[PDB]
A paper describes a structure:
Enteropathogenic *E. coli* (EPEC) O127:H6 encodes an additional, tripartite TA module, *hipBST*, for which the HipT toxin was shown to specifically target tryptophanyl-tRNA synthetase, TrpS. Here, we show that HipBST is markedly different from HipBA and that the unique HipS protein, which is homologous to the N-terminal subdomain of HipA, has evolved to function as antitoxin by breaking the kinase active site. We also show how auto-phosphorylation at two conserved sites in the kinase toxin serve to dually regulate binding of HipS and kinase activity.
To understand the individual roles of the two autophosphorylation positions, we next determined crystal structures of two HipBST complexes with HipT serine residues mutated to alanine individually: HipBST^S57A^ (2.4 Å, [Table tblS1]) and HipBST^S59A^ (3.4 Å). The phosphate groups on Ser57 (in S59A) and Ser59 (in S57A) are shown in orange and relevant nearby residues are highlighted. **b.** Close-up of the HipT active site as observed for the S57A mutant with relevant active site residues shown as sticks. In both structures, however, the Gly-rich loop maintains its outward conformation, incompatible with ATP binding, suggesting that HipT is inactive. The phosphate group on Ser59 occupies a position very similar to phosphorylated Ser150 in HipA_Ec_, despite the fact that this residue aligns to Ser57 at the sequence level ([Fig figS4], **top and 1b**). This position structurally overlaps with the γ phosphate of ATP in the structure of ATP-bound HipA_Ec_, suggesting that phosphorylation prevents nucleotide binding in the kinase active site ([Fig fig4]). Here, we observed a marked difference in migration between HipT from wildtype HipBST, HipBST^S59A^, and HipBST^S57A^ confirming that HipT^S57A^ is predominantly phosphorylated while HipT^S59A^ is only partially modified, consistent with the crystal structures. In summary, we conclude that the conformation of the HipT active site loop (Gly-rich loop) inside the HipBST complex is independent of the autophosphorylation state. We still don’t understand what controls whether HipT becomes modified at one or the other position but the structures of HipT^S57A^ and HipT^S59A^ could suggest that subtle changes in the loop can make a big difference ([Fig fig4]). Furthermore, HipT P-Ser59 would readily be able to (re-)bind HipS, and therefore form a stable and inactive HipBST complex as well as tightly bind the *hipBST* promoter, effectively shutting down the kinase activity, halting the expression of new protein.
Residue numbers in the entry:
A (entry chain C): 2 to 339
B (entry chain B): 2 to 101
C (entry chain A): 38 to 107
D (entry chain D): 39 to 107
E (entry chain F): 2 to 338
F (entry chain E): 2 to 102
Write the structure that this text describes.
């Protein structure tokens, strides 16, 4: 019924295939793409022993390098054009979650690299397993490398969460990161509105792991970099243990660095981030109050795209309801502001 | 300790060396192209530091890919740049770290 | 990427080309700068009669720097 | 090349240029048609002065206006 | 008694010397300057049998290179910091005329290099002879060379009067020359007002030999050249046949090039350049009518500086009278159209 | 017959030569400084002409200054390039024209 790349309804003929022609073309460039991998999971993905409970779900996730030889996906040792991300052995259905969240981001208007769900060749007569596939953004029109760098190295931060002190406190916030970006990329209100929305949407959707390595700079213009596309956007709401560890990967406001102050929302009857905290983030980026008010109204109107995308997805029903429950709650908190 | 050639866009841009005092990255005196990082401007040539530069440390892996590589190699716990040379021809962007 | 502005109209046209390549509409600019969509319209055609501060605020929101030379 | 930080910065630079050329406000009024009171407002903070008058004064002083990123 | 550099009245402590402390300092940089040359005229200037009567007065003028070695002027073979211009053997009192005209130009606000009159050592008990001295403008702070070029070579004109055709017509005018200058120097209202005034003052004062070699471009402020200071400004009014030969060295307007059209002033009961032709020159330079009107009124108000400077000068009484007569007539013509 | 070297601001910037076809001024292929004249731009290198370039002809002295020199060796205006070399170290500005030798 729904496309394994686009999540849009499949017409009469494409129903049995599971993929739409529009989707296959979006992901590969040709409608002749074969989204049924010619290899099995264990053929290329080794079973590494579990490390420690302390690391984020991304630490348990395998990553394969893929190249498109004709209309067939081929695993490469290095320098591929796509990356295959199978679900970790302990987190089943995580690839379906990253696919739903990344599809939602594209439908919301963000710059998201082309992606979809591909199935591995089965070992016997077991149910097909899907992995999330995404095109590498550090490639241009042809497979020529485009230079890029992660924000932790650019800002000269030694930890991706800003835990750079003598304690467990965080020393880099989204407010500081935005201030750094504004000074290195071209300023303009389009860049600022987008980056502000990325931070609000990581919070609304339950992506509490959008750290410094989840921001990049692409060197397309040559001298002046641009912000890299949205990548690794997953909702942690289906995993209660990981979801309650933090509201966001980094503190929202600069006043919160080193735990010196709480955000005004933490001092309210809500005791968590509210719309007022995001207005303060917007204000620090130079966005005008009348513009921030309109941006909040735009996010409220996008409720239908959020609900529909997750409900159309290949995520489990329990997982979808955990995400939409996080979303509805946090969306309601956006009204709590002056 | 060791010296490596840092390549950007397939061309040798500079060198990253290690010794008793620490690490040092330096662009070639005749390299007037784009900087490999906004943290390493081309206007400045020499970049000394006690620990491995945040740009070169950020190039190294972290989770599953660093773990799959570590179980088959098993090199020194704090072999900061030794791990970067092994994955030099497999980096993001247009950067390549090759042995000297 | 330095362009000498020949007439006020030349600047209005360059700012409008920049606005369109960024995908910014006139309403977004009105909310951010306070300049009305009708003044913004006059500005992008020929800012001769528009106040300097409004032209400077629009160039700023578009990421365009104003320079002086001889 | 000098990046213009604010409208006030431009009026001050145009006024410094006017004084180094030995041009008085009355000469500028006769040539541009802009009154000495508007010229006074312009050289202090051209924020509320029309763009065309700022552009005409920069022109008579031999100052070029450029745009960059 | 007036100063031989500034033409201002000498005070009690300067009266006997003939030079003021202000003037000696302006010209040399020190009040210890010796303006009484340690050499005679014939020691360094030779009398060669002349070309022919028909060459402009500048062709008959000797030029000596001078250097300032310890408050004393010394004649050098090449590249000095000052130039001595004695009166030509056939034009006595020409150095006193160039001094009066160049002093007037400085008093009028033009960029004029520092100058004065210096006396040669006398042969016997004859009255002292003076020569015009001027500091070279192609020098900076400590006589380092500043590059410059004349307008005829810059515009690629082979004759300094623009007589470049198959006939005897002039093909370059002040209007065309100004248009060329505006495209090569910094184009500003101060430069335009000054250049316009230089052309009007060459006409008012009787300098009918301000040709293409009498305009220069100096390469000082990096890349951007500037118009060179006023130099070689002499009134030809005391010499009737030279004065009558032309109103100006070049045609005033572009319409007059090749003799294709006359200036409107030539079609009027006046039959010469009038205020209306100079308004047309101003208009071509971008100067506004209200500004040109004010600029004319300033020229009328500068009448007192013109009269006074020539009357305070060391020029002969007959020569002053000829200059002021040219001046008064042409100043009256500025009111027309 | 003459390959005269032209030096601006103390250092040699190019060569001005004379032959059957006429005159030719050329800047050195490694000279990226300021032009000696607005009529001879730095961007263009070669400058051929049937007659002597208006810049080099304008450097030759006028009436008295040229008659004082043409009295010492007697130059009947036939060769204007040889007259330029007589006043080479006495030109206005920072231009100096010296022989190749």
């Amino acid at each position: 019924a729904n496309c394994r790349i686009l999540l849009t309804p499949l017409n009469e003929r494409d129903e049995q295939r599971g993929y739409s022609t529009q989707g296959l073309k979006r992901l590969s460039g040709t409608a002749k793409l074969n989204p049924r991998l010619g290899f099995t999971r264990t053929q290329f993905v080794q079973e590494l022993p579990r490390q420690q409970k302390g690391m984020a779900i991304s630490g348990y996730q395998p990553k394969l390098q893929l190249v498109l030889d004709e209309g067939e996906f081929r695993v490469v040792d290095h320098q591929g054009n796509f990356i295959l991300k199978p679900s970790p052995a302990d987190f089943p259905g995580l690839a379906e979650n990253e696919h739903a969240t990344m599809t939602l981001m594209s439908r919301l208007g963000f710059d998201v690299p082309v992606h979809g769900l591909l199935s591995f060749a089965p070992q016997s007569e077991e149910e097909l397993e899907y992995a999330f596939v995404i095109r590498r953004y550090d490639r241009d029109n042809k497979g020529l490398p485009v230079h890029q760098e992660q924000l932790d190295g650019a800002m000269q931060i030694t930890d991706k969460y800003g835990k750079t002190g003598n304690d467990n406190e965080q020393y880099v916030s989204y407010e500081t990161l935005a201030r750094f970006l504004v000074a290195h990329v071209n300023d303009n209100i389009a860049f600022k509105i987008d980056l502000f929305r990325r931070i609000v949407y990581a919070w609304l959707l339950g992506n509490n792991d959008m750290h410094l390595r989840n921001f990049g700079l692409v060197y397309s213009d040559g001298l002046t970099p641009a912000l890299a596309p949205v990548y690794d956007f997953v909702s942690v709401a289906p995993y209660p243990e990981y979801f309650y560890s933090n509201y966001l990967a980094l503190p929202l406001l600069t006043r919160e660095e080193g735990g010196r102050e709480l955000a005004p929302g933490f001092h309210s009857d809500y005791g968590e981030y509210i719309g007022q905290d995001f207005l303060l983030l917007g204000e620090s980026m130079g966005l005008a109050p009348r513009l921030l008010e309109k941006l909040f109204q735009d996010i409220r109107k996008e409720n239908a795209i959020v609900m529909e995308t997750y409900e159309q997805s290949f995520m489990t029903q329990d997982h979808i309801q955990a995400v939409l429950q996080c979303y509805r709650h946090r969306l309601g908190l956006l009204h709590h502001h002056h | 300790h060791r010296r490596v050639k840092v390549l950007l866009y397939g061309q040798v841009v500079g060198e990253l060396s290690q010794n008793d005092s620490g690490f040092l990255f330096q662009y070639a005196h005749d390299y007037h192209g784009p900087a490999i990082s906004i943290s390493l401007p081309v206007a400045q040539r020499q970049f000394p530091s006690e620990t491995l530069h945040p740009y070169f440390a950020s190039l190294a892996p972290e989770g599953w890919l660093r773990q799959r590589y570590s179980q088959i190699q098993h090199r020194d716990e704090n072999d900061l740049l030794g791990m970067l040379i092994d994955n030099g021809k497999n980096l993001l962007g247009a950067i390549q770290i090759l042995p000297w | 990427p330095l362009l000498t502005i020949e007439t006020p109209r030349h600047l209005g046209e360059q700012l409008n080309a920049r606005r369109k390549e960024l995908g910014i509409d006139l309403y977004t600019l009105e909310l951010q700068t306070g300049i009305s969509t009708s003044t913004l319209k006059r500005l992008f055609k020929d800012p001769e009669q528009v106040k300097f501060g409004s032209v400077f605020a629009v160039a700023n929101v578009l990421g365009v720097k104003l320079c002086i030379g001889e």
